Amino acid sequence: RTPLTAAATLIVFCLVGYAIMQLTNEVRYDDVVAALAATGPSAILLALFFTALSFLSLVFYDLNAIEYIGKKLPFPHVALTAFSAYAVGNTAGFGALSGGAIRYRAYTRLGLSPEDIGRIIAFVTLSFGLGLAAVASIALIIIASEIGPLIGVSPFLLRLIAGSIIAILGAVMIIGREGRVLNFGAVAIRLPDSRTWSRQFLVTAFDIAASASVLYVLLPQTAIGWPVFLAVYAIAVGLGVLSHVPAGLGVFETVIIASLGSAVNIDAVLGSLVLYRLIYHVLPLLIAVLAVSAAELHPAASSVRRIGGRLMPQLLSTLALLLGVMLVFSSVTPTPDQNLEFLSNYLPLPMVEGAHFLSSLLGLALVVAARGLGQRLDGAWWVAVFSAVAALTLSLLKAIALVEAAFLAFLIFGLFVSRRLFTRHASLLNQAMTASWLMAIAVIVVGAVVILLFVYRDVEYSNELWWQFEFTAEAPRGLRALLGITIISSAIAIFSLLRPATFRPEPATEEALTRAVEIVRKQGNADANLVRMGDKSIMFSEKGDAFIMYGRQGRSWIALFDPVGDHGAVQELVWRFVEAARAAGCRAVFYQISPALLSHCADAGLRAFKLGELAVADLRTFEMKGGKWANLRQTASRAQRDGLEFAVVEPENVPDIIDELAAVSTAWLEHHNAKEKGFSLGSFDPDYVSAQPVGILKKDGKIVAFANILVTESKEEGTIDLMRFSPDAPKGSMDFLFVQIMEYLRNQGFTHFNLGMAPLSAAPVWDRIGSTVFEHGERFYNFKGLRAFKSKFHPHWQPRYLAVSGGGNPMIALMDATFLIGGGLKGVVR
Amino acid sequence: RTPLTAAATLIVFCLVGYAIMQLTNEVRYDDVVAALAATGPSAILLALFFTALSFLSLVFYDLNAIEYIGKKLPFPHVALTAFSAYAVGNTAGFGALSGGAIRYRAYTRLGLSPEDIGRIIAFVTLSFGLGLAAVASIALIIIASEIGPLIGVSPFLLRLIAGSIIAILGAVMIIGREGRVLNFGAVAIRLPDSRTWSRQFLVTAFDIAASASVLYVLLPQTAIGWPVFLAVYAIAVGLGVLSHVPAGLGVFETVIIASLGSAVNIDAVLGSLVLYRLIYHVLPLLIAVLAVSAAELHPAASSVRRIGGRLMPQLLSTLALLLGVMLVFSSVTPTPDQNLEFLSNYLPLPMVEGAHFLSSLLGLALVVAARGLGQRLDGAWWVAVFSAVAALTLSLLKAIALVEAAFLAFLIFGLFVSRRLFTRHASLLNQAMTASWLMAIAVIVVGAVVILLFVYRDVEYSNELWWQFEFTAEAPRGLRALLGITIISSAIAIFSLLRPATFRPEPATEEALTRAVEIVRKQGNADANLVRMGDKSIMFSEKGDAFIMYGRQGRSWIALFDPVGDHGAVQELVWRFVEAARAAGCRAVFYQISPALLSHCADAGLRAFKLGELAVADLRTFEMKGGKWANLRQTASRAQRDGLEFAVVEPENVPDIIDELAAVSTAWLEHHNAKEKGFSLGSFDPDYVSAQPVGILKKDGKIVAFANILVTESKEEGTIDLMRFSPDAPKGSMDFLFVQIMEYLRNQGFTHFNLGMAPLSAAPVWDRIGSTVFEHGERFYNFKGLRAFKSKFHPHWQPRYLAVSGGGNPMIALMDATFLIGGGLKGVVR
Ligand SMILES: CCCCCCCC/C=C/CCCCCCCC(=O)O[C@H](COC(=O)CCCCCCCCCCCCCCC)COP(=O)(O)OC[C@H](O)COC(=O)[C@@H](N)CCCCN
Ligand SMILES: CCCCCCCC/C=C/CCCCCCCC(=O)O[C@H](COC(=O)CCCCCCCCCCCCCCC)COP(=O)(O)OC[C@H](O)COC(=O)[C@@H](N)CCCCN
Ligand SMILES: CCCCCCCC/C=C/CCCCCCCC(=O)O[C@H](COC(=O)CCCCCCCCCCCCCCC)COP(=O)(O)OC[C@@H](O)CO
Ligand SMILES: CCCCCCCC/C=C/CCCCCCCC(=O)O[C@H](COC(=O)CCCCCCCCCCCCCCC)COP(=O)(O)OC[C@@H](O)CO
Secondary structure, eight states: OHHHHHHHHHHHHHHHHHHHHHHTTTOOHHHHHHHHHHOOHHHHHHHHHHHHHHHHHHHHHHHHHHHHHTOOOOHHHHHHHHHHHHHHHHHOOSTTSSHHHHHHHHHHHHTOOHHHHHHHHHHHHHHHHHHHHHHHHHHHHHSHHHHHHHHTSOHHHHHHHHHHHHHHHHHHHHHTGGGOOEESSSOEEOOOOHHHHHHHHHHHHHHHHHHHHHHHHHSOOSSSOHHHHHHHHHHHHHHHHHHTOGGGHHHHHHHHHHHHTTTSOHHHHHHHHHHHIIIIIIHHHHHHHHHHHHHHOOHHHHHHHHHHHHHHHHHHHHHHHHHHHHHHHHHHSOOOHHHHHHHHHSSOHHHHHHHHHHHHHHHHHHHHHHHHHHTTBHHHHHHHHHHHHHHHHHHHHHHOOHHHHHHHHHHHHHHHHTOTTOOBOOOTTTTOOOHHHHHHHHHHHHHHHHHHHHHTSSSOOOTTGGGOOOTTOHHHHHHHHHHHHHHHHHHHHHHHHHOOOOSSOOOOOHHHHHHHHHHHHTSSOGGGGGGGGOOSEEEEOTTSSEEEEEEEETTEEEEESSOEEOGGGHHHHHHHHHHHHHHTTOEEEEEEEOGGGHHHHHHTTOEEEEEEEEEEEEGGGOOTTSGGGHHHHHHHHHHHHTTEEEEEEOGGGGGGGHHHHHHHHHHHHHHTTOOOOOTTSOOOOHHHHHTSOEEEEEETTEEEEEEEEEOOTTOSEEEEEEEEEOTTOOTTHHHHHHHHHHHHHHHHTOOEEEEEEEOOOOOOSEESSHHHHHHHHHHHSOTTOOHHHHHTTOOEEEEEEEEESSSSOHHHHHHHHHHHHHSOOOOSOO | OHHHHHHHHHHHHHHHHHHHHHHTTTOOHHHHHHHHHHOOHHHHHHHHHHHHHHHHHHHHHHHHHHHHHTOOOOHHHHHHHHHHHHHHHHHOOSTTSSHHHHHHHHHHHHTOOHHHHHHHHHHHHHHHHHHHHHHHHHHHHHSHHHHHHHHTSOHHHHHHHHHHHHHHHHHHHHHTGGGOOEESSSOEEOOOOHHHHHHHHHHHHHHHHHHHHHHHHHSOOSSSOHHHHHHHHHHHHHHHHHHTOGGGHHHHHHHHHHHHTTTSOHHHHHHHHHHHIIIIIIHHHHHHHHHHHHHHOOHHHHHHHHHHHHHHHHHHHHHHHHHHHHHHHHHHSOOOHHHHHHHHHSSOHHHHHHHHHHHHHHHHHHHHHHHHHHTTBHHHHHHHHHHHHHHHHHHHHHHOOHHHHHHHHHHHHHHHHTOTTOOBOOOTTTTOOOHHHHHHHHHHHHHHHHHHHHHTSSSOOOTTGGGOOOTTOHHHHHHHHHHHHHHHHHHHHHHHHHOOOOSSOOOOOHHHHHHHHHHHHTSSOGGGGGGGGOOSEEEEOTTSSEEEEEEEETTEEEEESSOEEOGGGHHHHHHHHHHHHHHTTOEEEEEEEOGGGHHHHHHTTOEEEEEEEEEEEEGGGOOTTSGGGHHHHHHHHHHHHTTEEEEEEOGGGGGGGHHHHHHHHHHHHHHTTOOOOOTTSOOOOHHHHHTSOEEEEEETTEEEEEEEEEOOTTOSEEEEEEEEEOTTOOTTHHHHHHHHHHHHHHHHTOOEEEEEEEOOOOOOSEESSHHHHHHHHHHHSOTTOOHHHHHTTOOEEEEEEEEESSSSOHHHHHHHHHHHHHSOOOOSOO
16 A cells, blocks of 8 residues: 555665665765865766667667557657656656656647557556666676676676576566566566567666666776676666665665675765766656746747646656755755855855755755746745755855755746646645655655764764854754754644545535536536536536536545536636645546547546447437338337337326336346436436336336436537336347337437446556556446447447556546445435 | 698698698607697587587578568578588588588578578678687787797787788778679678678677687686687688688698797697597587487477488588598507507407508598599499498508498498488499599598608618518508508599590481470470570480580580470489489580479579579560550550561461561661670571571561560460561560560460560679679670660569589680670581
8 A cells, every 4th residue: 555655665765774874884074075176077978878879769769669569650759748748757757747647738739549648658667667677687697707896796606596586577578479468466467579678678778788887987996897897887777766765766876886896895885876876867757847947938949838838847846846855955064164164154054054954945845846846836845945946045045055046046047937737726735745755754854864974974963062152063053953844844744644634525515506506507518417416516617617526435536427517617626626636535437438538637637548438319410211210210120119208207297107217226126136326327216217207118008117307408418328128128128218219309309318337348567546446347338238228329439537646556446436336425315 | 722722731741741740840749649638528528619619690691681581581491511511511611512512402492582692601601711810819918928928929019910801801891881892803891781791790700709719728827818819810811711621620720839839838739739620620520410300200300301311411521521531640650559469369460460450541541432422423332331331341450440430330230220311323443533622532541641741750761671570560550551651642633634425416317306306396495496596505404305405615614594395303403414414524504494493403503593583474474465565555656657577487488578577687787796695595597597486577568577486385485585676676676576476476375575685783792703794695685675775564573593512713615605695616507
């Protein structure tokens, strides 16, 4: 579960913290600084070059995935999207700052379908996963004789564990030949063709080589050699990824330091590690921001503008989070003694103490503003701008910190250039925090503790340090800043955990229900009539000419069947639902949304998973006397041979047949050995059945079947909700009932008839959802005819999606939806 | 040219001989023997394993090529063919012992078309070529810092030359994207898709790794390391391939010894090199032979049998050539002193001297028998069997050489098991020798000189050595054997160069011409009537009911349009032509053969290149009054509007219109500004025109066009040879002439009409032929209508091929064919 996973990552981070403090026992901060200064222009330029090559390779990851799904897209646009996904992903990788999240947001604007985008994401991660495994294992079998003495392991046992991984990968590839599906439980993996996976391997290998080469050109030494370096680099990168620490922050450095810490000077390895994290992590993100900001300030400009407007908040969230990390770490790190005596000869002592504490606290403020910046909040924007401008001013006062001032100025440039993208008036503090963002805050605080304990390893701790206030008392100043961020972070965690949610949402007021029904009547969507059940909460647009109907179940808010009413109010209502859901500490879920609402949902930060398809029949060319629908015609005659009669009972006369309808309804319930549903399906509640016309089927002067008919005043679409038959209803009864309802609808002048949802009839490279959605579709979408039955009317198949807010697991949202339908709230009952 | 290339390879071999004798200045044969004995079972077993892996990889080369051409073939059969191609190819690679030659012979039986097989061969060689380049260059850029000090070159300049090759390969790949054709003169290269070339790269890389690993596990050392070893191995393998020495015999060992000869003991490197050549070269060939022989002695047995019966002579040619090399080298190598004193205590001195000299000479006899074994000669078989049985007996007498006896026994097993495959009674000595086989003999003799000079480096040369005869005088014995093989080899070269050819072949005797024409009349092929021209030599089958007609031009014998007559005599005649062509010192060429003769031609050792297609019209459903041929019908009416008249003049009345035909013929010649042709095309010779019926076209009571009609008594097919029009012949004249000839043929009861050759309307990965054939087709196949004109009659397009014996260049055969047609012999003229 989400909290258990995060706590495991934190335990791993704290152990690798113990390790790195042990491994760097005889290294001091000044050695590391001297090492950073020793690095030549040549080494830096080569590192920039290899960073560039890595990022070109990664673009090819995404182009390959698009060729595999067979959906050509423009290179400028793919390139920008992939660059943005890997910048953000390599630096962070927790919810909404993942590569997957960047890919879903960018590619929805480029017009890939949610399953397209889901398959792309499965391709790119499995590629990286099996590729990294392969590269590592192959390298380790080749250089076991060289890496063994380095790490103090038998070159025989390495060659065994290396070779064993090679065997298992080989076995997977051979068992998964010709798209055979390998099931590791709920996970179903189908690998691609040998040719696809061969080109991808070469790109994964190029990229891993280029990145390793970045770190290699930065480390001065002649004792390891690129092949051994590549193996250790690959294993470090893989272990970091498995650890689930953001960027593999300690895991990567610990694997590199342990591995190379016999051959190489650990101060030089640490210097190289600092620059590696600057050049490979911090720089491509700065560049992405600068590019998009310059665009918004040429065909190039145009391309960058359209993708960046979409991605700029996630880039700026990641930039804010990095500059927060920077401010916190700089708080626990020593300032040059040159700068302090300059500050000694001008400013007074109390200011340079204040400026320090405050800059530490503004870093934590920037990491909170980062989560907000992701949600495009205006408050988050203001907080972030104030924080950055104050930290710019303050950092020069506390250490003449020109490079920190420069980075903060880049952030203020980007924030001012794209102010328009942050218009959402949801509260930043009220929103709460997720386990992932508490874990990132926790690694930042433990990072700071490790950094202080490394930096001031020599200083002897006294209770006097806490109240020591001198122009050159950096250890005291640092200890105090750390206390600061610790207490404020503990506060944030405590608040997120104890957050109130004002119980559950309110039910459907009598006045409220009427207002929604009137909106339903003068718009096109017939299934919107399900608000009449009164089992769903209603929240209106500000002007009152649109609404969302929704349910409450555990930690999900689940909306039903798109926003309803005036098309102009949809954008606002989608955003308002997701924010209010967030405010109550619940994930937002839209159940069975159309392709028209996918774009608006993607902005709000929701991922859409195809549930099934509606069968919609064009009534304006539904020609029964035509050869195409001859059997539909034939079975009406068969119904006439069985002496079946059809009538539409208008609402005020429904009371006269309620008793007869009630008997048929329960006869059906026990015949199918089933209970009533809710939410997406109506249940036999007299007042609900009484509110709409009923199509009834009669044999020997007795009602044998019925269906409540859902219509609007616009005549754009009709549908049915309940449709039930007595056990004795003759064969063809549905054929007869459906054919007569559609002809009645056809002649009164309705344009379309909705036969309702049918489950799925292309598979991601790796999937955990397919099985889950399939077991749900059959459970709910087969009550009023099978897919084959609906196909006989030659309908348009439009897909419908489950859009879910939290990125944890699509399945958890559908399980809350399953109870809302299966059990759920009782609601209004007569 | 063929001789210049071979002489360049020999100069390279002699220089690398100087080098290897220099590099091994302080190494003695006993050190190398001690090294071979030091090798453990573990190292040998690992080497066998890596040999197995290499050979599995190479099978995937051929499967990949078949997928690229889109022609699925059974894995057992492909696997056996690829194994056989690489065994033979790695060991030899000169004409008929190349991988290409093994592929053309095996895949023709499996039913791939000659262009299929041509594209496969282009795929596999370019794959190996660019792959080896890539592997080498990539390895060299990665380990330049490690290989530099080893070879005494700047790791900077290596990284420059390595990187420059990488750049050029990269540039080729990028310019050749999307099947763009890159022309390096006559050579047109179109690379495959990124995905194909990516999977192939991974196989080439696996194979090169596995082979390198064979040599690596055999060399005892801890000072180089597998990556540096791989780079040096790849460069050695590439240089050997470029040198064109068989197996890269000295080039590979010299590159390996120079490279590793600072770090590794050269005696141990040389021991490792000996075993490498045993395990990677000699063993897979032994195994192939054993497998096929056991097959001919189960579904496995069946598969092996069908492919081996086809390939067994080329395997056994390669085995004989290796055992010849063995006997020669063993002659110049020392025998154990243990064995000689055993021979001292029993046999007398004169026998063990004789046995030595004779075994040397029988090795050279086996290398001559190898060329014969390739041609499936019975004489070659007998010679090879006698040689092997004598050398078995003799080797035990001269050195108790049990392992040599064993290898010779494998050869005698294989020869006896497949005696049936060697039935051709062509003379082995009369056949002569090619430049390639003289070059192989020359490297074998220089190999022997280098080996003797290395083995007896210490011995001080005297004229007394020549006549020293002692049980322990091995250096004398060796010197004498070397003199032996030198004089006998010089004799063979001298004979091959001075070989007589009894001038040129005889022309068509009056009696001979009649006998052929009578054969033509009672068979189906109408174009066989071209023998009547009397410009072509005729050679009959033994029973006299079939014949081949052919021409003589420079160093080619060119047959015309398949063997003619009784189907049963074709196999014998194809073989007889190729042998007699060989006897006269000329390449055999069949010009425009049908698919039915490709199999028989493939056995004889000819490679077929598609020239073009015949347009053959089914006259039994040629319905002019049908809607499908409405315009053909319309233009006959247009001809009637132009007042055109048609008649077939029977042969005895042709003299009455000769003068009128002669005027039309020359009027046509100058109008098209052209001269008469020969060989495949008739020319206006009165006696030739008089021998067959003439279709004539008349306007205003005057002949304006004519065509001689070629028929047989069987009514299976008709065609035309000359078809000529006066400059004033009205538009549609051909349409009219062709339509009337076919209707006349249709009603008299002929089943097919041959419209004649049309040039080509899928490209090898690399080709040198395409341009050449295209310039020839347009030059000769457009005299009696364009391709588009022939398509109007809706014909069957059957391809026709140029099958050429010598593997040097297809183009050289077509140039001799071009003169035979363009100029050629005058022939019989009236
Ligand atoms: C004595 C004992 C000896 C010890 C020695 C043993 C050696 C063992 C060797 C270990 C190698 C392990 C490799 C495992 C790889 C896991 C990766 C994976 O599953 O896919 C990643 C991460 O996926 C996960 O979430 C991990 C799930 C764990 C289950 C799988 C474990 C088995 C190994 C096979 C993997 C199969 C595929 C996984 C299923 C999806 C997803 O990729 P992302 O898009 O997240 O991309 C990653 C980042 O964008 C890049 O990474 C970074 O953070 C960058 N800093 C990297 C820098 C370079 C960028 N060019
Ligand atoms: C100071 C100076 C520093 C010096 C250092 C410089 C380093 C330079 C590096 C050199 C690498 C050169 C690589 C060139 C490769 C040429 C190969 C080629 O063209 O294709 C081979 C041979 O093709 C030829 O006939 C050679 C023609 C030369 C022109 C091309 C030269 C440019 C290089 C690019 C090549 C492009 C492709 C060539 C055009 C067709 C054909 O393959 P085969 O089927 O004959 O297969 C070969 C054998 O079956 C295997 O080889 C053996 O004999 C075995 N013993 C090998 C053992 C392992 C088997 N698994
Ligand atoms: C949850 C998300 C985490 C993602 C993190 C992943 C990536 C890791 C990068 C971190 C922050 C990058 C942004 C910062 C970039 C700016 C870097 C820069 O310019 O250097 C200094 C920044 O302050 C600083 O010393 C800050 C130093 C930042 C670099 C440290 C990288 C750490 C990795 C090394 C291995 C140890 C592992 C740590 C765990 C034990 C300024 O110098 P200046 O002249 O003004 O005066 C000296 C100074 O002491 C004044 O206070
Ligand atoms: C044109 C075509 C050329 C293709 C050639 C490419 C491949 C190269 C293999 C050659 C022949 C392979 C067949 C021979 C396999 C049999 C090998 C074997 O069993 O060993 C001995 C064979 O005799 C021998 O010493 C013969 C030795 C054969 C192995 C030598 C390989 C040479 C390569 C090493 C580097 C130098 C480069 C040479 C150029 C300077 C028998 O021992 P035995 O107990 O009976 O008593 C010792 C003896 O002195 C009795 O006379």
